[PDB]
Scaffold this active site. Sequence first.
Site, mmCIF file in Angstrom:
data_model
loop_
_atom_site.group_PDB
_atom_site.id
_atom_site.type_symbol
_atom_site.label_atom_id
_atom_site.label_comp_id
_atom_site.label_asym_id
_atom_site.label_seq_id
_atom_site.Cartn_x
_atom_site.Cartn_y
_atom_site.Cartn_z
ATOM 1 N N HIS A 27 0.805 -1.216 0.000
ATOM 2 C CA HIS A 27 0.000 0.000 0.000
ATOM 3 C C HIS A 27 0.838 1.266 0.000
ATOM 4 C CE1 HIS A 27 -4.508 -0.495 0.857
ATOM 5 N NE2 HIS A 27 -4.084 -1.631 0.333
ATOM 6 N N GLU A 51 0.515 -8.039 0.962
ATOM 7 C CA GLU A 51 0.998 -6.735 1.400
ATOM 8 C C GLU A 51 2.489 -6.728 1.700
ATOM 9 O OE1 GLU A 51 -0.540 -3.600 1.893
ATOM 10 O OE2 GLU A 51 -2.130 -4.464 0.595
ATOM 11 N N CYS A 128 2.572 1.971 8.120
ATOM 12 C CA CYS A 128 2.692 0.824 7.225
ATOM 13 C C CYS A 128 4.071 0.808 6.581
ATOM 14 C CB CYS A 128 1.595 0.863 6.167
ATOM 15 S SG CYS A 128 -0.009 0.465 6.863
#
Length: 161
Positions: A27, A51, A128
Amino acid sequence: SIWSRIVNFGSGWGFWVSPSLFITSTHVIPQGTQEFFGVPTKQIQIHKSGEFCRLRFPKPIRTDVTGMILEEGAPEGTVATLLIKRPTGELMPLAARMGTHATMKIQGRTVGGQMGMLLTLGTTPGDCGCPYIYKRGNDYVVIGVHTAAARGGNTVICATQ
Ligand SMILES: *[C@@H](CC(=O)OCC)[C@H](C[C@@H]1CCNC1=O)NC(=O)[C@@H](CC(=O)[C@@H](NC(=O)c1cc(C)on1)C(C)C)Cc1ccc(F)cc1
């Protein structure tokens, strides 16, 4: 020195596992960019596992770092450390007791990773990409990169593989 391996990458962060191996969160990767750390993307081999994103560079970028052990999560019950770097520069090591390894449905997307529970502020949206690391004997082991966290509760998700 292990903090010097966490780098601003896109809207989040990435971790230098080796002189040539960058890992980050899918992401977070900038999708309009054609070079990473001065290397053209055409020469960069990018592998995606949900991810967990892995960038192998043609030529070592960080001469100074030693290679680290990369594994698919940690044993259930291991207290890993979530090395969160903040845009201000502050360093937030967070303790997370890791749990079930599973393929998870997060917002309609399928994600392989390991859930964890932060022990005793918290994580936020800039975070993240930061790595989960635990010490095994004398060697550090990186197990994944932060990808998500429960709106209600301590739960954090660590993308793996
Ligand atoms: C980091 C990435 C970001 O900002 O990207 C925008 C898409 C961010 C970190 C979390 C926000 C709050 N605290 C964090 O640590 N990640 C995300 O926004 C992912 C989505 C979530 O974290 C949600 N969480 C869940 O759905 C969830 C599911 C489970 C078991 O636990 N939590 C929000 C509640 C914050 C983005 C994402 C990642 C992977 C996917 F497959 C889909 C979406």
